[PDB]
Amino acid sequence: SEGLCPPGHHISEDGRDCISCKYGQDYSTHWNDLLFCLRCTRCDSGEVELSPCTTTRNTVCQCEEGTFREEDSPEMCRKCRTGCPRGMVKVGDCTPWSDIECVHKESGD
Amino acid sequence: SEGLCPPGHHISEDGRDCISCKYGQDYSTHWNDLLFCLRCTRCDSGEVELSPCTTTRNTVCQCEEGTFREEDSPEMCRKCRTGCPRGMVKVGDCTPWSDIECVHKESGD
Amino acid sequence: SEGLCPPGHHISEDGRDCISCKYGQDYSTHWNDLLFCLRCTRCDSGEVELSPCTTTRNTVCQCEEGTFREEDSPEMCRKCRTGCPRGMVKVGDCTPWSDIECVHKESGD
Numbered sequence A, B, C: 001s002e003g004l005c006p007p008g009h010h011i012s013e014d015g016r017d018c019i020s021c022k023y024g025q026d027y028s029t030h031w032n033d034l035l036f037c038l039r040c041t042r043c044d045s046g047e048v049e050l051s052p053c054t055t056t057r058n059t060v061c062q063c064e065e066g067t068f069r070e071e072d073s074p075e076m077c078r079k080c081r082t083g084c085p086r087g088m089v090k091v092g093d094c095t096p097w098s099d100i101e102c103v104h105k106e107s108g109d
Helices: none
Strands: A009-011 A018-020 A047-049 A061-063 A088-090 A102-104 B009-011 B018-020 B047-051 B060-063 B088-090 B102-104 C009-011 C018-020 C047-051 C060-063 C089-092 C101-103
Touching: none
Parallel strands: none
Antiparallel strands: A009 A018, A047 A061, A088 A102, B009 B018, B047 B060, B088 B102, C009 C018, C047 C060, C089 C101
């Protein structure tokens, strides 16, 4: 369809005009259909930067191994399970965003 | 924006950012729009890894020779038959998933 | 004779032998038949171990005085109030698990 602007640029309401956005102000990752540019993400200590932010790129935030990010916490990472629940076993990997996996097999019938 | 992310990627809670997932830590097979990355599958002793997983692949498990596993019973392997009782003839190959094949012979007496 | 190992011991994949697990490295509360032993619980900086884990026991974590946390939270602790709002009274104690308690007008005459 029409009314779309390439990355780093945005299109007006009337769709007959597109304006350029400045490096570092705001960015667009995919063809945008708005008059504004999206805010760029920044990282803080305890987190690792994987990719740069630019009119054609987005900054990536990642958390250090051993910690996890749950939807119940804001830009925070928590220590993964330090021991599966009583009657379970270790089998899953912990990702800065997801938690470990525990499985029940031998513990009361 | 629609809010969809390609395979191997996830979208943060804010819906305006998409981040890459690490090989073996987790992946996505089909287009998704969540802050979660799909966990990778692991196999246990007695079973071998047929194909490791990546940001665009799923891990498969294998059973050692002499065992069998039908789609009707997962996470289970059973001893494959080495020869049908007298009267039957072995003619099929045994695969960690399927069992041998036996056919009745009219020849003889 | 059997395929079971007592608490504090794990068994090999072939079941022909069982290896002993030692306190502080891992433990088991009930009989089991696995290759690994149940992990011992450790606490992060700012938290203390209330009770260590032995070959037959599990370790509990505690948070330092002045901070508080509910069982519903992962393991974060918050600073208890050192003075109820203006026109309030102090009457409850703050425990790393519980928060301070404030009351209005102790008693009249």
